[PDB]
mmCIF file of C-alpha atoms and ligand atoms in Angstrom:
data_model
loop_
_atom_site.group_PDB
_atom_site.id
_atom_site.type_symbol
_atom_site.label_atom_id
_atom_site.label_comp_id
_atom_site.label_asym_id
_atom_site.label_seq_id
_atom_site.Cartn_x
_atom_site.Cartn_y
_atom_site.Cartn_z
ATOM 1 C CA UNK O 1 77.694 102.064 109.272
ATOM 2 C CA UNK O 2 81.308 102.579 109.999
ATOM 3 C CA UNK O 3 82.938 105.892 108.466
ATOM 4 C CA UNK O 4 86.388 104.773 108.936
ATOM 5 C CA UNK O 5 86.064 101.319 107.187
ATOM 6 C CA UNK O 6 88.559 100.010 104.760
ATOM 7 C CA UNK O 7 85.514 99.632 101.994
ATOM 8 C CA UNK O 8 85.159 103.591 102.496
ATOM 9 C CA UNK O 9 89.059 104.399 101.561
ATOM 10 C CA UNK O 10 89.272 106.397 98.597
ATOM 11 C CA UNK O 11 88.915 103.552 95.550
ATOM 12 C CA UNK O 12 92.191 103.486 92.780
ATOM 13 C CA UNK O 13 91.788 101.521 89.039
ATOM 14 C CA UNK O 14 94.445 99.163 90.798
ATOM 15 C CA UNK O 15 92.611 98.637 93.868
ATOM 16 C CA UNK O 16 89.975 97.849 91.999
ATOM 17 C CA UNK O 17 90.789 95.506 89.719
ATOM 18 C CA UNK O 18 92.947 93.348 92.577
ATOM 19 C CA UNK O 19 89.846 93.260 94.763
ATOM 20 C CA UNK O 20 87.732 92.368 91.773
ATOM 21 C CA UNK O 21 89.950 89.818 91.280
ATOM 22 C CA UNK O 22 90.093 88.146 94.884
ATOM 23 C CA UNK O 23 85.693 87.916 95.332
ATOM 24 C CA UNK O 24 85.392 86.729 91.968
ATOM 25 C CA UNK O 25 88.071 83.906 93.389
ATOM 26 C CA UNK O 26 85.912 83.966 96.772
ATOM 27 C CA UNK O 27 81.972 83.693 95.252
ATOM 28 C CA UNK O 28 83.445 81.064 92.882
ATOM 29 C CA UNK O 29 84.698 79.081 95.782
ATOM 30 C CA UNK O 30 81.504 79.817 97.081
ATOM 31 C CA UNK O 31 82.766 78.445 101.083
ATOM 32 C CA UNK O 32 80.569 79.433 104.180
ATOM 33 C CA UNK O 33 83.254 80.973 106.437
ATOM 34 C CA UNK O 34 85.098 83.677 103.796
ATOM 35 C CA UNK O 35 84.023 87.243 103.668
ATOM 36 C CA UNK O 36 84.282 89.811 100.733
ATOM 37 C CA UNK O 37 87.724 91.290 100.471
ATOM 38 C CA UNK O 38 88.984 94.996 100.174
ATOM 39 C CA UNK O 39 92.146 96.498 98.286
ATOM 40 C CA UNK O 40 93.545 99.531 98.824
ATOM 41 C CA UNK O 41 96.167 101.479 97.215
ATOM 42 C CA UNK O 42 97.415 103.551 100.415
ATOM 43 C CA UNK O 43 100.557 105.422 99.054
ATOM 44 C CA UNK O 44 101.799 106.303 95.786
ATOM 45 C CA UNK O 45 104.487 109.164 94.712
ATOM 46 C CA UNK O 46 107.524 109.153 92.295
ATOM 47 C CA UNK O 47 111.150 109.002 93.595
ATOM 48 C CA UNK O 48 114.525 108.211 92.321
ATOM 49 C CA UNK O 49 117.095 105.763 92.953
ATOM 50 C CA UNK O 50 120.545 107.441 92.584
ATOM 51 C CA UNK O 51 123.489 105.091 91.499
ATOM 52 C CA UNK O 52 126.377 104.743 94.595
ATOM 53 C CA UNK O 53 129.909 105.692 94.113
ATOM 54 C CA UNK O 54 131.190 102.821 92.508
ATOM 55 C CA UNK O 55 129.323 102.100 90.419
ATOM 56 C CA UNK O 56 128.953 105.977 89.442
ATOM 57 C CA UNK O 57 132.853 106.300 89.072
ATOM 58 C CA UNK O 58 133.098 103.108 87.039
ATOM 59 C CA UNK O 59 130.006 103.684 84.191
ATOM 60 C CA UNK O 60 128.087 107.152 85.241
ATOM 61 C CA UNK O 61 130.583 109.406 85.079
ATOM 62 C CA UNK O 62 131.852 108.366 81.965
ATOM 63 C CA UNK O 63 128.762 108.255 80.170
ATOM 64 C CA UNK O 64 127.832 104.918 79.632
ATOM 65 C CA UNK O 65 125.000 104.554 82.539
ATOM 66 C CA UNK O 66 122.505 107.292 83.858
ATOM 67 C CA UNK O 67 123.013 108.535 87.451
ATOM 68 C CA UNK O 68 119.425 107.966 88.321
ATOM 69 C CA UNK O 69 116.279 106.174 87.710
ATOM 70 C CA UNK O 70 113.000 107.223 88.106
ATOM 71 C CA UNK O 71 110.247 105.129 89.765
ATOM 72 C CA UNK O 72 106.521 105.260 91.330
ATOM 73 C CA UNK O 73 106.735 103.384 94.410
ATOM 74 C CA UNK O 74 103.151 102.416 95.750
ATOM 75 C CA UNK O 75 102.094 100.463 99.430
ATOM 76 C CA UNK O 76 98.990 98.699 99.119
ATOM 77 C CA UNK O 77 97.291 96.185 101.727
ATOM 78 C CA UNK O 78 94.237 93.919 101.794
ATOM 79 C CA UNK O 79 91.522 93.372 104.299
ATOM 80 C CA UNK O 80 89.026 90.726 105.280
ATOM 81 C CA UNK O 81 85.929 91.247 106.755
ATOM 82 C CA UNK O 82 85.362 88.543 109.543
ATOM 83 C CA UNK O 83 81.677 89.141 111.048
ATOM 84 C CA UNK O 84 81.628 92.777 110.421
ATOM 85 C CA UNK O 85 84.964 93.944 111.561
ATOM 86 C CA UNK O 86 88.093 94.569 109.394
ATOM 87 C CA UNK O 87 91.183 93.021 109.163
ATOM 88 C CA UNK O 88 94.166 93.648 107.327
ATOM 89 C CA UNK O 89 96.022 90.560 106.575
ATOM 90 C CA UNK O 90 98.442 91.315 103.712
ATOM 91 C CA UNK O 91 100.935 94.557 102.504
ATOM 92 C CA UNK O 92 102.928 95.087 99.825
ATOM 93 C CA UNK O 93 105.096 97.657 98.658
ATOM 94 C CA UNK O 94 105.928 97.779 95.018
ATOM 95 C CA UNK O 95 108.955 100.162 93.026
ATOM 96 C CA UNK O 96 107.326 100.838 88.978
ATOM 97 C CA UNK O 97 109.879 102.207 86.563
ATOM 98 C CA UNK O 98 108.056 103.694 83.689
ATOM 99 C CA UNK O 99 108.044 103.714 80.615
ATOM 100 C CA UNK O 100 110.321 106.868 80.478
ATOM 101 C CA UNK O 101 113.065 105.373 82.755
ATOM 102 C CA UNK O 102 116.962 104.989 81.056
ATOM 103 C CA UNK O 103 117.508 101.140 80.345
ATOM 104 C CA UNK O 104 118.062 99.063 82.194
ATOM 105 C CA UNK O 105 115.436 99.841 84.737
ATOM 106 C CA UNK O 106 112.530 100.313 81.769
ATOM 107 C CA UNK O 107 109.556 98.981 82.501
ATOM 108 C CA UNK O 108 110.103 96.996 84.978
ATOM 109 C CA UNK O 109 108.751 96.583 88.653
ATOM 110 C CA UNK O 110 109.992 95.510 91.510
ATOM 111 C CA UNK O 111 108.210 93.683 95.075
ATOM 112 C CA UNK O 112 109.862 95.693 97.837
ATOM 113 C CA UNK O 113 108.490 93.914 100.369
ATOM 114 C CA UNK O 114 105.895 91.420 100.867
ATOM 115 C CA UNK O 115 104.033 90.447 104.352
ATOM 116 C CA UNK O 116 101.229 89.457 106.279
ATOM 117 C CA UNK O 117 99.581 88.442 109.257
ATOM 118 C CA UNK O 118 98.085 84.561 109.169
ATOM 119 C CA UNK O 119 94.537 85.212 110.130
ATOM 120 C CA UNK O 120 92.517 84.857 106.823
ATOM 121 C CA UNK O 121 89.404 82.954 107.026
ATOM 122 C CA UNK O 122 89.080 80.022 105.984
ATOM 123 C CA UNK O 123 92.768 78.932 106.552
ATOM 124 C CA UNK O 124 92.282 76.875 103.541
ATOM 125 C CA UNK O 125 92.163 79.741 100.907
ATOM 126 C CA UNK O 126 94.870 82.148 102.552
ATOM 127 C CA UNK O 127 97.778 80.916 100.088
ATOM 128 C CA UNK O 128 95.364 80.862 96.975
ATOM 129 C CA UNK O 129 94.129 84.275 98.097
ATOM 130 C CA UNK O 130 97.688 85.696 98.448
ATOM 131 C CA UNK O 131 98.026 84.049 94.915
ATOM 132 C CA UNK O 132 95.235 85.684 93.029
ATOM 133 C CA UNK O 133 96.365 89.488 94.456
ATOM 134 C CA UNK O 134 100.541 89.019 93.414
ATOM 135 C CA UNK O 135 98.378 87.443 89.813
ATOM 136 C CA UNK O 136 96.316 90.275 89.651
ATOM 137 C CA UNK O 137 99.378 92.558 90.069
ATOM 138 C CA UNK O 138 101.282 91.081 87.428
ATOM 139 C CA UNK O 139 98.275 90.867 84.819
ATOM 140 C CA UNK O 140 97.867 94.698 85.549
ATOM 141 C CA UNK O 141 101.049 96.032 85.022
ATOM 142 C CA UNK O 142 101.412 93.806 81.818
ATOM 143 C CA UNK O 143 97.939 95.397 80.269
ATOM 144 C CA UNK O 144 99.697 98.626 80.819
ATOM 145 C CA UNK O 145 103.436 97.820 79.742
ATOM 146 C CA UNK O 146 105.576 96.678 81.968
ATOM 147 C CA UNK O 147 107.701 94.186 80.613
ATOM 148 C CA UNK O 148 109.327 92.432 83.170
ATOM 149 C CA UNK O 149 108.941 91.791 86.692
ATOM 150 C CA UNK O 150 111.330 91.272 89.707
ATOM 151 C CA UNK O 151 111.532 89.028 92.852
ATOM 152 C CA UNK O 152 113.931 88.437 95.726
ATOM 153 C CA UNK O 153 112.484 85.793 97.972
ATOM 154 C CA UNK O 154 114.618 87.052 101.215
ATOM 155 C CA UNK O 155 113.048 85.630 104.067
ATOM 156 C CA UNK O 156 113.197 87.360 107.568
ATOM 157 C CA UNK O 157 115.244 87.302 110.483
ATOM 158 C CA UNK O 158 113.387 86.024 113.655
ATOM 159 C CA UNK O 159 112.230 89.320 115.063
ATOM 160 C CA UNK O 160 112.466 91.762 111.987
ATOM 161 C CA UNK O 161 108.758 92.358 110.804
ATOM 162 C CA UNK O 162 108.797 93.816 107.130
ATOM 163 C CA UNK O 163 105.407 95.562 107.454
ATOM 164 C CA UNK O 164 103.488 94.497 110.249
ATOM 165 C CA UNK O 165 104.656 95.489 113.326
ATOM 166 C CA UNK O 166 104.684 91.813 116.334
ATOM 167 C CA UNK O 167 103.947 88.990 113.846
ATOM 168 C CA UNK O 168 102.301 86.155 115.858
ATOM 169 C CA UNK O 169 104.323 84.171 117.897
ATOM 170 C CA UNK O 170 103.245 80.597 115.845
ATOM 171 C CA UNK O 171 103.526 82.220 112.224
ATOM 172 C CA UNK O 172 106.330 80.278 111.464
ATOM 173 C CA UNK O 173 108.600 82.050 109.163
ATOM 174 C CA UNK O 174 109.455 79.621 105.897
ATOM 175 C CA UNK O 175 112.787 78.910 104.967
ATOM 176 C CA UNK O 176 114.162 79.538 102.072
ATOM 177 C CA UNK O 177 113.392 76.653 99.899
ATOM 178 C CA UNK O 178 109.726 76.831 101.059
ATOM 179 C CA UNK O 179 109.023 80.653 100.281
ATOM 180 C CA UNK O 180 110.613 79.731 96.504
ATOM 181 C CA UNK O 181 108.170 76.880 95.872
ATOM 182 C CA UNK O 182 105.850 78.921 97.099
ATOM 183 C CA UNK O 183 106.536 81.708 94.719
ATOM 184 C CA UNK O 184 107.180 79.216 91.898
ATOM 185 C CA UNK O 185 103.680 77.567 92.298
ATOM 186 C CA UNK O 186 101.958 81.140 92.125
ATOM 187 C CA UNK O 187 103.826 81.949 88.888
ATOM 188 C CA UNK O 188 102.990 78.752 87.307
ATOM 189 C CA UNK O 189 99.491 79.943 87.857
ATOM 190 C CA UNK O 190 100.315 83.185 86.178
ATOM 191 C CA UNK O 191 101.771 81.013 83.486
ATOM 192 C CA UNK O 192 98.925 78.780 82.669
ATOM 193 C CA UNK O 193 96.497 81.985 82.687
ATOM 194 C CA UNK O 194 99.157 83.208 79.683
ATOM 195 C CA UNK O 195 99.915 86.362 81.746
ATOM 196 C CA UNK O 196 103.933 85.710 82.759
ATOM 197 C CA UNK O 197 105.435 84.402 79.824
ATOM 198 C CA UNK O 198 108.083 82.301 81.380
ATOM 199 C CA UNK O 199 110.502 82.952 84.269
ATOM 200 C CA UNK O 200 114.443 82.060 85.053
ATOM 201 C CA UNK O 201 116.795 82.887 87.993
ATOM 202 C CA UNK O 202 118.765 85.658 87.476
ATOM 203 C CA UNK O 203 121.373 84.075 86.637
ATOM 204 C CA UNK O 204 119.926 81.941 83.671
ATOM 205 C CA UNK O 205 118.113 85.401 82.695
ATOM 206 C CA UNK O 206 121.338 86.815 82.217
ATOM 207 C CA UNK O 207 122.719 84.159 80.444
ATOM 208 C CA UNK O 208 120.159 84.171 77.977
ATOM 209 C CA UNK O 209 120.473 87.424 77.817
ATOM 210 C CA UNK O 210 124.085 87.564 77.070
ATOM 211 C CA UNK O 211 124.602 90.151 79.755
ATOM 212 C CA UNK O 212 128.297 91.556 79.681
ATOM 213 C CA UNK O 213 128.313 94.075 81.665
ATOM 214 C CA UNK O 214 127.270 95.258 85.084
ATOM 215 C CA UNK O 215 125.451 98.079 83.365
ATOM 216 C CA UNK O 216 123.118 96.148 82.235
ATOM 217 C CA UNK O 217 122.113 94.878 85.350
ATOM 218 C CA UNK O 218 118.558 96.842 86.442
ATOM 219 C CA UNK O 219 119.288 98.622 89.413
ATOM 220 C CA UNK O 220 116.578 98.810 91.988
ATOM 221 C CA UNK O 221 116.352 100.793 95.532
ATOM 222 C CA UNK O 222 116.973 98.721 98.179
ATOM 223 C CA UNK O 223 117.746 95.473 95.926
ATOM 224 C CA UNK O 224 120.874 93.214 96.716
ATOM 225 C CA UNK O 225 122.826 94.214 93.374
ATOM 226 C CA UNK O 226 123.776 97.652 93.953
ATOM 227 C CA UNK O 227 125.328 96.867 97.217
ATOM 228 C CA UNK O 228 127.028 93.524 95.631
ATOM 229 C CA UNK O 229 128.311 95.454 93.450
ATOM 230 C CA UNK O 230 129.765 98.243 95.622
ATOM 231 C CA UNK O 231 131.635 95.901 97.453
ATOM 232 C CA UNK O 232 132.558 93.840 94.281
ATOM 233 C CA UNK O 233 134.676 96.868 92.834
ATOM 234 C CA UNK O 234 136.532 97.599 96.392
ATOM 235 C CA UNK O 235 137.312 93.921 96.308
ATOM 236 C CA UNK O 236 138.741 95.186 92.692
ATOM 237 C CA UNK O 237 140.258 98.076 94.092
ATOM 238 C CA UNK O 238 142.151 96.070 96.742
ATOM 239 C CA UNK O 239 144.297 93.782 94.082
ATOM 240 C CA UNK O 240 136.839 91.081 86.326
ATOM 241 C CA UNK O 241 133.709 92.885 87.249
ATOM 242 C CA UNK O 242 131.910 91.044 85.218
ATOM 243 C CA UNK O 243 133.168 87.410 86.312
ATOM 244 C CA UNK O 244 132.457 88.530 89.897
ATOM 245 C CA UNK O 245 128.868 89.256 88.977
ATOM 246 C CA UNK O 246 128.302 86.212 87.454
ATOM 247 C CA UNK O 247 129.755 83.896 90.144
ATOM 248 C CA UNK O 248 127.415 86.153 93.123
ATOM 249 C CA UNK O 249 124.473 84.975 90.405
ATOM 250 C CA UNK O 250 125.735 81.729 90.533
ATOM 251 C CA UNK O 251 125.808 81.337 94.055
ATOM 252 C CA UNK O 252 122.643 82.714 94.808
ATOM 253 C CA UNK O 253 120.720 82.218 92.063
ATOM 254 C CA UNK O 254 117.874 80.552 93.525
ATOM 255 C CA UNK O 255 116.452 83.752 95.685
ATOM 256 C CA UNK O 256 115.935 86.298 92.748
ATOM 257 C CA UNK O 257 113.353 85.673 90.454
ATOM 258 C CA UNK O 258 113.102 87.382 86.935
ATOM 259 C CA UNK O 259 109.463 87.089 85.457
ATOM 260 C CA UNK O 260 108.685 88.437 81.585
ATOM 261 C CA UNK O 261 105.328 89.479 80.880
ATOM 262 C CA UNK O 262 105.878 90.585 77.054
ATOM 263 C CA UNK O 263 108.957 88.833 75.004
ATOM 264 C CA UNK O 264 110.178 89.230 72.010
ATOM 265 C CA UNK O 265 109.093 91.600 68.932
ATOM 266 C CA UNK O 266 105.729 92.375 71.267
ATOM 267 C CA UNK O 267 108.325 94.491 73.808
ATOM 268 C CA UNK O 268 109.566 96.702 70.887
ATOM 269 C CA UNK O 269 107.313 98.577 69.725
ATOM 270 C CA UNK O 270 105.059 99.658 72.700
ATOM 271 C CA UNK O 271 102.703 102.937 73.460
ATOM 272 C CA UNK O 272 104.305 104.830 76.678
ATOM 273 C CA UNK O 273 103.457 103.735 79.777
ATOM 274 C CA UNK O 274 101.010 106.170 81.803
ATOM 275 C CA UNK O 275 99.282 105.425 85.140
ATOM 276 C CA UNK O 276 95.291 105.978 85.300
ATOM 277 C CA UNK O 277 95.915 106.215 88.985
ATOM 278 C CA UNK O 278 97.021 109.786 90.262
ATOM 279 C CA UNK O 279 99.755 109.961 93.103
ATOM 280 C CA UNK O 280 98.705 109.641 96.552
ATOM 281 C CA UNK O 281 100.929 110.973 99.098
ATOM 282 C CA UNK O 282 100.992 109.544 102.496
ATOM 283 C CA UNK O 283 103.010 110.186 104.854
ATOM 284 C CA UNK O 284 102.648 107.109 106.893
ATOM 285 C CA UNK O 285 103.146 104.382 104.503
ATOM 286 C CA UNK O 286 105.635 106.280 103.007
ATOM 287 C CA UNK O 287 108.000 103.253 102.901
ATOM 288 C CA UNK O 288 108.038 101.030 105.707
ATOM 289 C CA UNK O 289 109.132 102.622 108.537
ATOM 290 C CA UNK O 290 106.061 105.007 109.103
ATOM 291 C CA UNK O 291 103.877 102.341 110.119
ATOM 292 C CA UNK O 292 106.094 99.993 112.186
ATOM 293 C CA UNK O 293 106.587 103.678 114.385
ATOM 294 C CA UNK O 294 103.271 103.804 114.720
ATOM 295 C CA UNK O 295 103.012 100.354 115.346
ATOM 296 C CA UNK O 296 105.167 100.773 118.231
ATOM 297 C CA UNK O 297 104.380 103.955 119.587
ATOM 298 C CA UNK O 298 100.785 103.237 120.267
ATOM 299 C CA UNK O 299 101.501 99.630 121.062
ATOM 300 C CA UNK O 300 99.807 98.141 118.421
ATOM 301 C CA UNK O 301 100.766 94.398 117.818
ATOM 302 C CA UNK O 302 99.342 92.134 114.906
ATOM 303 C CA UNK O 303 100.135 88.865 117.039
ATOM 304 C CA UNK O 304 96.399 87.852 117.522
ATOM 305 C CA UNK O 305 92.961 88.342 115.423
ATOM 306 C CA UNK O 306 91.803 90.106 118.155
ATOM 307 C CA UNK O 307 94.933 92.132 117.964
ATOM 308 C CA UNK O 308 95.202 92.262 114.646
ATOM 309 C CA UNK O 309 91.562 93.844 114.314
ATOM 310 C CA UNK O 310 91.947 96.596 116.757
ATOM 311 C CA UNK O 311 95.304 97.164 115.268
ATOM 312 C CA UNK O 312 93.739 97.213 111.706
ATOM 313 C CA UNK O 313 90.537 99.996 113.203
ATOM 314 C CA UNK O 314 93.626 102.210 114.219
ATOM 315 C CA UNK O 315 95.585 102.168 111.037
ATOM 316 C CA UNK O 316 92.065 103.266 109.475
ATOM 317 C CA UNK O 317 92.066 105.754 111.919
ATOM 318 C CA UNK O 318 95.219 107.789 110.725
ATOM 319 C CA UNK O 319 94.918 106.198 107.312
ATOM 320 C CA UNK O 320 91.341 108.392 107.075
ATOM 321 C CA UNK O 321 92.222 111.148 109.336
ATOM 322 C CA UNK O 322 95.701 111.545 106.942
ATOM 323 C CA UNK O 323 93.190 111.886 103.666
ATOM 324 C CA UNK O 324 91.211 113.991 105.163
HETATM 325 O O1 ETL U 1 106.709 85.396 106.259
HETATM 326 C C1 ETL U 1 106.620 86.605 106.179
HETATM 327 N N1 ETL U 1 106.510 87.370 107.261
HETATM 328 C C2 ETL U 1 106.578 86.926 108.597
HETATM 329 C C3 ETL U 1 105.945 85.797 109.121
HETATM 330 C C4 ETL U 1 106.172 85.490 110.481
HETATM 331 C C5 ETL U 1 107.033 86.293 111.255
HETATM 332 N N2 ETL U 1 107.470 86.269 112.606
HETATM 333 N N3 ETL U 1 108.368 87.391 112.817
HETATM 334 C C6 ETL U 1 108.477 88.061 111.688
HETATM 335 C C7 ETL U 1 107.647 87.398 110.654
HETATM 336 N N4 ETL U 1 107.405 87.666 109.361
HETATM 337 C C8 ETL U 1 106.664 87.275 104.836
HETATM 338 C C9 ETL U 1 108.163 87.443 104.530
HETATM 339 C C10 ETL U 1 108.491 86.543 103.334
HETATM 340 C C11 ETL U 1 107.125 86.036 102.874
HETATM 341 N N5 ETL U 1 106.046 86.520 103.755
HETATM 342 C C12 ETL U 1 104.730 86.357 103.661
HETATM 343 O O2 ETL U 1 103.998 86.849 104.522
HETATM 344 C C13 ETL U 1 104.092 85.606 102.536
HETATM 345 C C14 ETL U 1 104.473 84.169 102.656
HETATM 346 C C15 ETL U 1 104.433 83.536 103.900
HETATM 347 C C16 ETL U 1 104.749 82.184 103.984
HETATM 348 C C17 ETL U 1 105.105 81.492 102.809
HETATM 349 CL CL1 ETL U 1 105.529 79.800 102.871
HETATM 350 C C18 ETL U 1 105.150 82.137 101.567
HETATM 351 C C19 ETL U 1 104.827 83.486 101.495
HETATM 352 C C20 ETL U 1 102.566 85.650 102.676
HETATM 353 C C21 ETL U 1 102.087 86.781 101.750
HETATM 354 C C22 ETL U 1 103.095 86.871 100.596
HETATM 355 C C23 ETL U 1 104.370 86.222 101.151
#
């Protein structure tokens, strides 16, 4: 028995129900070299995301826009166990504005950050596995009331790990076509199981939408848009707002996903949105940065399983010894 094991971290309904979700997938695949999977919830507190000066001068001050937005930001990673030792092979981190956000951030969530570390086992389920826990995310924040969720499939630069700290050197990073199939084939899963109703680039979205101004536009921390826009009014400044908006959708409309998960009269009329889960504060997967320190400070590299697994005890390590 192993007191610092990823089954032993303190359980959350979300956890839960995503792990629940994965060895159902596993037992029904019912394949020889797979092990039961674990899903853990690791940080969760409330933040906002404060509108830059711009944008501020341009719609906040004058009424029409609120200066901030609320949101529950959560990290979360999953874990394999591979003959009796852990592994974690997958991260996500995950911005959730409620239910009593100001339009046009109301219930909707965003995907930070997605990555992981190629050593699930059997190589042959590792995509379908990745599927059924970004499924299982959407189908839970849909029971609760979230209306609409966000993607931007940014792929990295050589070098930059999102989450875990010294990728292996043959995880090939995809390009940018390949990580939007890839996204498109899970959400036509989602689709078929009737959880995402449909989904559009952002562009189309806001077409059909018949978004006129920037205002409308949900503004998420860390997300491409606020920054677009920032340098959209200087350009302004230096000689429409809206026109420039639409052409940067235009361009790039490809990499940002919107997904609806209620539509239509359904959306109107729903209870508030409240979290069974309590807040967990964590200092080290407090964002991102926490854990690639860590990473590097005690040398810890996810370039190998063998790596990867004494890399994955350690996290436990603090990840207990933080808890506690
Ligand atoms: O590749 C990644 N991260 C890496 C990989 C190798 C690396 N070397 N150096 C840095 C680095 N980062 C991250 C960043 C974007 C998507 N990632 C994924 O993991 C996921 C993915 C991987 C391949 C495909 Cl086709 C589609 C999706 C797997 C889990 C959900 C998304």
């Amino acid at each position: 028995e192993n007191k610092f094991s990823a089954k032993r971290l303190p359980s959350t309904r979300l956890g839960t129900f995503l792990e629940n979700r994965v060895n159902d997938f596993l037992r029904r695949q019912n394949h020889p070299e797979s092990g039961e999977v674990t899903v853990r919830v690791v940080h969760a507190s409330d933040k906002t995301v404060e509108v830059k000066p711009g944008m501020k001068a341009r719609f906040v001050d004058s009424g029409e826009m609120a200066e901030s937005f609320p949101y529950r930001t959560k990290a979360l990673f999953a874990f394999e166990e591979i003959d009796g030792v852990d592994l974690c092979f997958f991260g996500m981190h995950v911005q959730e504005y409620g239910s009593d956000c100001p339009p046009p951030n109301q219930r909707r969530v965003y995907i930070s950050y997605l990555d992981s570390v190629h050593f699930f086992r059997p190589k042959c389920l590792r995509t379908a596995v990745y599927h059924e826990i970004l499924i299982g995310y959407l189908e839970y924040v849909k029971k609760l009331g979230y209306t609409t969720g966000h993607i931007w499939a940014c792929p990295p630069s050589e070098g930059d790990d999102y989450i875990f700290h010294c990728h292996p050197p043959d995880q090939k990073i995809p390009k940018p076509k390949r990580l939007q199939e890839w996204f498109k084939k899970m959400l036509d899963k989602a689709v078929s199981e009737r959880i995402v109703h449909d989904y559009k680039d952002i562009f189309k979205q806001a077409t059909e939408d018949r978004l006129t101004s920037a205002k409308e536009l949900p503004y998420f921390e860390g997300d491409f848009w606020p920054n677009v826009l920032e340098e959209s009014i200087k350009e302004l400044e230096q000689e429409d707002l809206s026109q420039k908006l639409y052409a940067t959708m235009e361009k790039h409309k490809e990499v940002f996903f919107v997904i609806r998960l209620i539509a239509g009269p359904a959306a109107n009329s729903l209870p508030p949105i409240v979290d069974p889960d309590p807040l967990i504060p964590c200092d080290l997967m407090d964002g991102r940065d926490a854990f690639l320190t860590l990473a590097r400070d005690k040398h810890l590299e996810f370039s190998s399983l063998r790596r990867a697994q004494w890399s994955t005890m350690c996290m436990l390590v603090e990840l207990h010894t933080q808890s506690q």
